[PDB]
Amino acid sequence: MMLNEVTAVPGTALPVAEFRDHLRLGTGFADLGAEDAALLSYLRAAIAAIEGRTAKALISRGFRLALTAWRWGDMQTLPIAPVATVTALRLVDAAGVETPVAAGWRLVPDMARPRIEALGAMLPMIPTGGRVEIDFTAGFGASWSALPVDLAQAVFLLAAQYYELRHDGAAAMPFGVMALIERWRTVRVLGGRP
């Protein structure tokens, strides 16, 4: 289970022109672009902070889930939660040959449990000494407008903070950064074997 990203976000999909409206920089100056190189450096640093505390994705970039042994006999819950249209469960071999498999696997969409449950009571078997990478595109939407807005606000509450204080300097809201995140975190109570 490695879970790397195939492609990153384009950067042009991030709302730098709206984050600048948030931070109260300035309206009609002739410069207007001295911060563009750094404002998206804090938006990518605040999304990636909330992508890890919530285990959500938010831009629907493509992922690659390269794993070897199945976690449970048939289920295989995916880590990145809001998914749609798993592309390919290409089953690599011990070395080399990569054979994509329709394989009779389904996809159960959920924000909490994005399973990949199999229908033939057993997922496609795994060549001993070989991995099973799964290409899937997981996230809310393609553009910034398709997000839940409270999670989009939690980026703006957080990336404004990184813009206003640079080093770790200490400085209570009703719905702060944390209270907006908490309905998007994963609530789990299993430490067991299954």
């Binding site: 033939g120 009571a121 057993m122 496609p124 078997m125 001993t128």
Partner: protein, 48 residues
């Protein structure tokens, strides 16, 4: 596979196990019979 002597034979494919589900649906009939018609007639209506 036919195993050679200098082969150092690899493991083969365990057969896939299928599990097909019977849904077990219901089938019911609810006839409406009159109480007077069940009490007057010479025929055994609850049997018929």
């Amino acid at each position: 596979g036919w195993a050679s002597e200098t082969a150092a034979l690899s493991e083969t494919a365990t057969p896939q196990i299928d599990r097909i589900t019977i849904p077990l649906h219901e089938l019911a009939a609810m006839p409406k019979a009159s109480q007077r018609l069940l009490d007057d007639s010479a025929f055994d209506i609850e049997t018929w």
